Design a protein around this motif. Sequence first.
Motif, short mmCIF file in Angstrom:
data_model
loop_
_atom_site.label_atom_id
_atom_site.label_comp_id
_atom_site.label_asym_id
_atom_site.label_seq_id
_atom_site.Cartn_x
_atom_site.Cartn_y
_atom_site.Cartn_z
N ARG A 74 -31.59 -39.46 22.54
CA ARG A 74 -31.10 -40.26 21.41
C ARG A 74 -29.87 -41.10 21.85
O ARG A 74 -29.01 -41.37 21.01
CB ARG A 74 -30.73 -39.40 20.21
CG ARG A 74 -31.95 -38.81 19.47
CD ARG A 74 -32.43 -37.52 20.08
NE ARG A 74 -33.63 -37.03 19.39
CZ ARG A 74 -34.19 -35.85 19.63
NH1 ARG A 74 -33.56 -34.97 20.38
NH2 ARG A 74 -35.34 -35.54 19.05
N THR A 96 -28.20 -43.96 9.69
CA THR A 96 -28.24 -43.02 10.80
C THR A 96 -26.81 -42.63 11.18
O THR A 96 -25.98 -43.52 11.34
CB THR A 96 -28.89 -43.66 12.03
OG1 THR A 96 -30.22 -44.08 11.71
CG2 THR A 96 -28.96 -42.77 13.25
N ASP A 114 -28.10 -39.41 15.54
CA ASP A 114 -28.71 -38.31 14.80
C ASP A 114 -30.04 -38.80 14.21
O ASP A 114 -30.07 -39.20 13.05
CB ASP A 114 -27.78 -37.86 13.67
CG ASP A 114 -28.15 -36.53 13.03
OD1 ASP A 114 -28.93 -35.79 13.65
OD2 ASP A 114 -27.61 -36.24 11.95
N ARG A 115 -31.09 -38.85 15.04
CA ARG A 115 -32.43 -39.21 14.58
C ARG A 115 -33.47 -38.40 15.36
O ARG A 115 -33.23 -37.92 16.46
CB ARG A 115 -32.65 -40.72 14.75
CG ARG A 115 -32.69 -41.20 16.20
CD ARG A 115 -32.54 -42.70 16.34
NE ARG A 115 -33.54 -43.47 15.59
CZ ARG A 115 -34.57 -44.13 16.14
NH1 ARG A 115 -34.82 -44.05 17.43
NH2 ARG A 115 -35.33 -44.91 15.38
N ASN A 116 -34.66 -38.24 14.76
CA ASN A 116 -35.66 -37.36 15.33
C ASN A 116 -36.34 -37.98 16.54
O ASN A 116 -36.59 -37.29 17.52
CB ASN A 116 -36.72 -36.97 14.29
CG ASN A 116 -36.15 -36.02 13.25
OD1 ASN A 116 -36.26 -36.26 12.05
ND2 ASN A 116 -35.53 -34.95 13.71
#
Lengths: 182, 180
Positions: free
Chosen positions: B33, B54, B78-80
């Motif tokens: 990320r 985000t 902070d993302r999948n």
Amino acid sequence: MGPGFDFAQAIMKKNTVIARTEKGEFTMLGVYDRVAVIPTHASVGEIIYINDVETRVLDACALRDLTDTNLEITIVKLDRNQKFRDIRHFLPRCEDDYNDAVLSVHTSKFPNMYIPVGQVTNYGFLNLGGTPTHRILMYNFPTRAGQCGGVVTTTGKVIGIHVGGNGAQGFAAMLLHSYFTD
Amino acid sequence: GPGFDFAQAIMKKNTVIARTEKGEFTMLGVYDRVAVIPTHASVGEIIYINDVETRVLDACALRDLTDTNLEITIVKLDRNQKFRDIRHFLPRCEDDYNDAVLSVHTSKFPNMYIPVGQVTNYGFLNLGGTPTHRILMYNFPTRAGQCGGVVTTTGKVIGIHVGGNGAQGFAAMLLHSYFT
């Protein structure tokens, strides 16, 4: 990236098609109705491919000035089932120099291509591949094979189509409003 | 050449639209990320990525061992979704290049490719009054906006566009060691 690219993009997204002749793939600018332009060296015949669709050519005319000198613009009328957005109001009326132009190309080889070419000179006469040619615009960018037919714009004006280069400089044929009076 | 294929392949999988307080920027995701953006974008605690709010977990405004600005900010998001790893396409050293492409991706300029050609190791630049190192330079005879874009050659991701003077355009080098 900036307002020049904005205008170029708006022209590309609505007023270009991919034209294929026996001499290659060209960016082709649609001007109004079913009327487009392409460099005369594309050698348009009776049938042309438009976005990979076989299309009849209703008329094609290789333009020359009144001294009977090559202009390197062919005006084509396509037997297409759809009209182009009319952009004739963006064509200049007279021969001129320009600041801060963009050359834009869209082919299989060069999709979504945009080049800031800088200042454009009214160059005039060019011996283009051995052929005396008039109304040439010049820009100091090393253009390459695949860019012929590319659209030259400034903000608010469509001023030419790319027709050649010498490795250091690129050359475009002028578009004038008077070519497309119906 | 294959330069255009390469630029498109990087754009398709590794380029996202980032929106800060200052507006929209072409953002390059590098691995996991981790992404990069010009320092002038003024990354905050929150950023939009393809129009999604985000959290930014970490932001590092890079400087070299002389304690000089490099105008790259590295961000951890902070993302999948994870970015396709492209660290192997980053140069190990400072270099000159030929036949580069600058690739722009914003809401206003989606999927736009600008052949800039010859790229010089320019080095030092006073950028907006800040002394900056590791600047690449190409002809760019226009006054562009801030959004920038990713600079590639065949086989390499070499820099991100950070500014210009109306004649020349300037990119910050990406080096492999920034992400080890």
